[PDB]
Structures are given as C-alpha cells and as structure tokens.
Amino acid sequence: MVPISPIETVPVKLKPGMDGPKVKQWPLTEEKIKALVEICTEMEKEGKISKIGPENPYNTPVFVIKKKDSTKWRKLIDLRELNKRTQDFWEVQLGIPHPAGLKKKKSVTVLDVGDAYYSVPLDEDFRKYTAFTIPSINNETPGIRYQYNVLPMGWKGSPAIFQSSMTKILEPFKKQNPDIVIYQYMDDLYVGSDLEIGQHRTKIEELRQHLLRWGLTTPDKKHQKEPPFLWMGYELHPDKWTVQPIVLPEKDSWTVNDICKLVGKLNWASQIYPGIKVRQLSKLLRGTKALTEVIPLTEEAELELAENREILKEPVHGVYYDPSKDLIAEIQKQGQGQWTYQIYQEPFKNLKTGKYARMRGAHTNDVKQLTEAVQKITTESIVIWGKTPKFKLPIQKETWETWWTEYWQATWIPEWEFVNTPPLVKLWYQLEKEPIVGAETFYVDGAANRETKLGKAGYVTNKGRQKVVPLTNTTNQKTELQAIYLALQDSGLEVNIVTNSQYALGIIQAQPDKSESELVNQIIEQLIKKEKVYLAWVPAHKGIGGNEQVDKLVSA
Amino acid sequence: PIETVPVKLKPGMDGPKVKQWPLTEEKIKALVEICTEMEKEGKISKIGPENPYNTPVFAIKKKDSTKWRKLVDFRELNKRTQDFWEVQLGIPHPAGLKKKKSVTVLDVGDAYFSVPLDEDFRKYTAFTIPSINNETPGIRYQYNVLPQGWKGSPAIFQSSMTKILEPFKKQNPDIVIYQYMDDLYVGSDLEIGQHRTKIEELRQHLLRWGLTTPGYELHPDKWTVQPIVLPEKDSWTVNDIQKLVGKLNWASQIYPGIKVRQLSKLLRGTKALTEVIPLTEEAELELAENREILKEPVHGVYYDPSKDLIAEIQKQGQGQWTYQIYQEPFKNLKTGKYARMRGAHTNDVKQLTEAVQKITTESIVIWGKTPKFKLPIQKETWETWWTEYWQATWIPEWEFVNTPPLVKLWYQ
C-alpha cells in the first residue's frame, strides 16, 4: 500500500485500440530547470508524483510559466498527443457566471482552493500514461521519470473531473445548508449568506473543515474576508460591482495582432460600459494574411476608437439582481447595423449592457436586426436570470404590427412597449397589395450570356414607353434587378412593375433598407421615393402580355 | 429483477453528443424536483464526465395540465437506435384508427419506468441539468429504466403492454388501440359518453397493473383536406388573369390536365394591370374544366411505408396556416388549413408550434409516423421560443426554409 487514496476517482479509458504517448522532451533552459526540480521533488513526498522504472515506455514534454501577478511558477505538462488519443469527456462547465446574476447578500466570502488539480486523484490504471522525463543542468545526468498520482495541468480531462469531483464534495454541505449560496467555478468558491457576519464566518470555517476532510485546502492567503472581492475578473462591492480596470494599448503604429487585443478588450468592456462600437475597428481585420502585418487606421476606426476610449474615461458600475422587481431591456439603434442595449430593474441603475452588431444576410432591414437583437438578449437573460426581460423598443407598435403580420416568415417579439428614443426603427417603403389604377405598367426583364457575361436590361409599358440597355460583365440575376431599377428610375411616383424574376421579387418583397449589393441599394433608394409600387410576378416563357415582348428585346 | 433486453446502436454509429440549452428558472426548478424524486426511486442516478454522451432535457406542461412533465429530446438517440424499433420489435399500424369517430390519447409513459434498461445502453441516456447563471456545473444523470420519449421504450414494453391490453381487447373487440412512444391512441365508434366511459375502464385496467395516467380527444372523421381553389369573379382585370395563369401553371406540376392556353389568349397585348378583360367562352370553359380537375385527386398518390413523410407549412396571414404532407414532390398525401389557433393574431411562434403539433398528431393517427417539417421561420427565432409553447411528449424532425411566396396557391 505505497500510495494512499483520498477521494473517489473517475474511470478514464484510452480511446480503443490506442496506446500511450511517446515523444522526446524539449531542450529546456537551465534557468527554468531550477524552478521545476524543486517543486517536482516535493510532490513525491506528498504522493502527488511517483518514480517509475523503465517498465514505463512513455515520454511527454514539460514546461513552466510564471503565475500572473506572482513570483511563483506554474507547472504544466504538454499532453497534446495524449489528448488526441484519450477518450472524450462531456464538459460540465456550461458557461461563465455573471455578477449581474448575483443577488444581494449580507455576508460574502470568496475562498480559493490550493493546489486544486493536485488534490484530486487521477485514475489508478490510467496513471501509467502520464510518464515524463525531468531534465538536468547538464545533459549528463538523465533525470528521473515520473507518473502523476493526481490530476495534471495540461490534460484534457482535468477541468471536468475536478468540477464534477468538487460538486460531489460540496453537495452534502449544501443539503445541510439550503440557504447558503455557493458559486462554484473551477476551484474559486463564492459564498454568500444573509446570516449576520459573525454567524456567517462560523459557516465559512465550518465549510473549510468540510473541504479539508477530502484533502482540499483553502489557504488564508487567497481567503477574501473583506470587500471589495476579486471574482471572475470583477470587483464586488456590497451594493455594486464593476469590471477590474481594462488597459487599452496605446501603440502609435498598429499591427493586426494589435487590433485583435483592442477589439477583444472592447468586447469585454461592453458588458458594462454602454455604447462600445467595434464595427470600424473590425473592418480593418477583413481579408488580411499575417497576424504580424502592420495596418493603418482609417478615419472611421480612429473616430470610433476615440469615443470608445472616452467612454472608459468615466468609471461605471453595475448593480445586483432583485428577483422581486421586473427585468427590463432597452435597445438603441447605433447605425450601420449596430445596436446596444441596457438591462436594468430600477431606471438608470444597470445590471449589465451589451451590443449586437452582427450583419446577417446580404439584404436586410432594421426590423429584422432589431428582432435578432431581441432574441440575443432573451437567450442571454435566460442564462443569467432564467427569465425574459420586458422590452423597451425604439419601434412604433404599428410599424411592428405591419411587419410581422405581412411577413411570410413566422416572427415574434416577447412582451414589449414603445420607447420614443430616436432614431426610431421603421419600414422605409411599403409594396401595394393590389395593382394601382392609373399607374403606368412596366413589364421588365433582363437576360445575360453565360459565356460572354454580356446582357441586356429593358422594359415595355402599356403607354408605349420602351427601353433596352446593354450591360457588361453581368449575370441573369443582375440584369433582372437592373430591369426593375430601370422601371423605377423612368416611372412616375406610382408604378406597376411586372417581373418574372423570382430572385428579384424575393429580395424586394422583404422590404430591405440595406444591402451588400450597390444595385439593390439603388433600387431601395428609388422605392423610398415612390408613393406607390405594385410588384407582380408571372411565369416566364408562357406567352403572357408584356412579359413576352420584353423577353424578346433583352434576349436579342 | 426483470430480464433486461439488450440494445445496440445502428452499426457504425456512436451515441448522441448534444449540448444542453439554457432553461428558464421555472423549468430548472421543476426538473430538479422531478430528478430528485426519480433518483430516490432509482429511475436515474448521477454520473460523471467520463460518460461522453449527452441529450438535451427540458420540461413541458401538456394542454390544460398545469403540472410539469419532464421531456427529453431523444431525436438524436432515436435516430441511432432506429433499426431496433423498426426491424424487430416494432408495431403495426391500424389503418382503421383514422376512421373511428373518436380517438383518445393517454400518457402511459410512467409504465416504462417499471421495466429496467440494459446496463450497457444506459451510457447513452445521459442528460445534463443546467444551473441559473452557471452557479453550479451541470448535474449529469443517466437512466436505469426505460426512459420516456426513447423509441426503444415502447418496443421493449410491447410484450408487457399487450398482456395488459388483452383482457380489455377481448371485452371490446371493435375498439382499436395504437401505441406511439409514450402515448396510447384509443379509437372507438361509440357515442361520446360511452367512449369516455370505456376510457375510464381502460384507465382502471391500467391501474390494477400499476400505471398512473395524468384525455386528449380526437375525431379523425371530422378531419378534411384543403383543395386548391380558383376565384370566382364577375369581372377579371389583366392582373387577375396574370395571377390565375401563374397559379394554374404551378398547379400543372400536380394535376397534368391543367391547361392555360385559352386563358393566356386574354393577355396577348401589353396592357395596364387594372384593365378589365371580358372572358371568352373558350376561356370560361377552360377555366370550368380546370376547377373540376382540382376537385379530383392526383393520379397515383399512395403512401409508401419505407419513405419518410415530409411536412411543409405556409403562413397565410390573419391567423391562417396551410400545410401539405408528402413523400415525393407534388404527390401530396394530405393538404390542410389551420385557422384561429391559440396565439392567433398575436404570436406567430405559438401558432406555428400548435400547427406542428396538430400535423404530427394527424400523421401518427393516419400513418404511425412523424413527418420532417420544413418550417417557415428563422432558425434562431424558432429555437428561442418553441419550447415555451410545446405541449407534446414527442418531438418531430424539422428544418428551416425561407421561401417567399410568388403565388398563394394553397390559400386564396
């Protein structure tokens, strides 16, 4: 019985018909070797590590990185080849806790487990595959080979095994203490109660004894008796919370990697700081080869970056969640398919903020994007609070009613009210349901030659108006749109248009206000200027009316 | 202490790995309460991350129930068990069930908990319970018995089920019973009161065998279809005839006897859309002959047991929805319309959800299958809301389509 057993282990098979890792160690510099050898030798006395005879035919590289904000070093074993061949697990970490989720508590304790990975036993049969060879100051001394007796940093089964093991240990305590809140994220524990501060600390220490029984040690050094607590990158105060300060690079010359950090920082910032915009900064990253390449900032990304920094200038903070009061989400349109939102309960006291900028579709409008933002907020809210907020939306009740009733897709927004904060979201134009009496009827068509990429777009009308236009470097689709554009240009404020293009009719009937295609944008521009447009569809090549005549013209 | 029937996945197919989606606080609370009791009774037990399979779980309230029902989305598992519940232990379909004046649906899901489940198979029934704001990691379980909503459950229990049924079946030979997953379809031609009474008898009959039943009533004979219809107009504008020709031309992919020649003649010029066009006698007769053909059935449309059912739905506005069930394109086994459903004029998603359920129910009664739905909705819109309005114990297959409607062929 050379090694003791502390807590229940997790069976871990290899992927079937596959064998343990073999790969030679790195040429590690002696400076790192000093740090590694001292800690690694200590492990054997505890029982974390064991010596192995050459009967163990497995070798895997090893390396070390300094603990951030500490002099200590972190001991990590590269298991990339072992991961590849190790059985798949099901991750039990389904997301990240957000402080806006937290309810107010009278007493809050944050405590961190020490050597959390090294306090959880690895599977006995699986221990052999860990084997790695230590290095020496010279290449003469071989260095001992070691197999882990506990979870090792760098494996792919470590987080899930620890989290599941931690939950099993915590579960008896929680059942005995139904009114204690324990937020368990990896080894960090957040403990909150409405118990008075003296009684709360009694439970806190009593919980520490419970974790001690299973070999889990909570050092005082990482204990956080007193606010403001540092938790998941946030600063927690009795009645408010905020993000730990974010440093934005100041570089005078920006590379590609530069913008990524910036962008990724601003996304983290936008959870509380209202109105962060990354659109123009992200425009710089599209279709670039090298992460190292240097790129100059446009006057758009510069102006953007300027007001983004100024938002960070003033300190902001969020509040906590009061289950008694309603949840309210308000959304503002920021232009260029950019939307920001605030979730709150008391007016002007925000739980959190956020943005929805995703451009979805080649042709779209503001109503679709607002519906997308509402959905993104709803799912986010259900994660954090388990309910859907009431919505305050910058869209008239009649605008929304007109859109969803007429749209051919099922669409819906949950309970919401109108807020009159401009810019309001509206439909820029409306297609007529019935043909317009006394309006000129334009029969439009276009065709193009697949080989030459040459084509014609034209129309014929009941009044005798006619046009045919030659086009270069086009497609059948593009000429069918062009024909419609021509009819809109050359018509009065009211016009009936008959097309046989399903492509064009589908784009235009969805009432888009923005498009990737400039041609569609120009069609939109004209539709907005009209008083009445009736679009109608007929099947091609059926000998119908004007459609037959215009088909002949453009085919020529 | 019952023998456990061994089960295997379809060859070359691994188990389901499907992430758990976020749940509302009420559903999470209901699931935690439901699973706590189920663990104490031994139906499920907690499991570790070493199991690499997961299936989504959530809770529903059946129509008017007010009492939460656990529901597992086993579609992925059921697809990987598929050969089992078809090739071997499957159920025949009573072609007469659709003919009965009344059909009641009973939730016998509880019965499945009696039988135990093959120890080797339980690794595939894993499901994770989420926590609000990720306070805790996911609490994983797996099934020790026959799970509700799995397609092996009614097949393994069919031997047990028939013996319980058999005294009741002998007492009433005429009555027809069909079993689809957790549900028992009981179709009688009796009068309403006698019918309801016999259901209580089959309830008690189920009770003395140890089964609780928490009544969905159908009248499959009332069910009708929705024919393609052509408008009746005193006068026709050029636009009306253009719409009519387009609708008829599309219809000719279904009824090959449709002819547009005489109706096309009416639009030879280049005419204003609102210009009134008198119909000729030749066009009147062509239009008359067409309306008759549309009353007729399509030639050679018959159900094929091998082929999958496909359902398409269209949103017609004003609370009206149209659907077509088929296996081959343009060979439609049924076409229908739904109006004034729950959520009409206020919620498209609630209405679409109700529509999917009704269509699936009809397919179960008529063919003992569930169709694959082509849903006229955006993937993110459907996934966000659909569980809120779901009141059935099964879950059909669906895909998402965005077809703008050139012509309103199915509706008017």
Place this chain on the structure above:
DNA sequence: CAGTCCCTGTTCGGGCGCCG
C-alpha cells in the same frame, strides 16, 4: 432529362478577449 453558375445562408475552426 444532367450539369453547370449564381446566389444565398449555414457551419466550423481560426484569432483574440475573459475565467480557472
């Protein structure tokens, strides 16, 4: 009646940010 080409939308893996 296949086979393309347009055109659109989805998915998935890459980078970064953040948390252990």
Place this chain on the structure above:
DNA sequence: TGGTCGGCGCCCGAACAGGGACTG
C-alpha cells in the same frame, strides 16, 4: 526562449448545402 487544458464571448473567412435558371 517559442510551447498545456476546459469554458464562454466577438468577428473573420473558407468550406459546404441547396434552390432556380439556364444550357446541351
């Protein structure tokens, strides 16, 4: 020195699916 794991978020681009129109 360059180098590990899991989770979540964003924004990207490439690779893939599929529906119509048209070409033989």
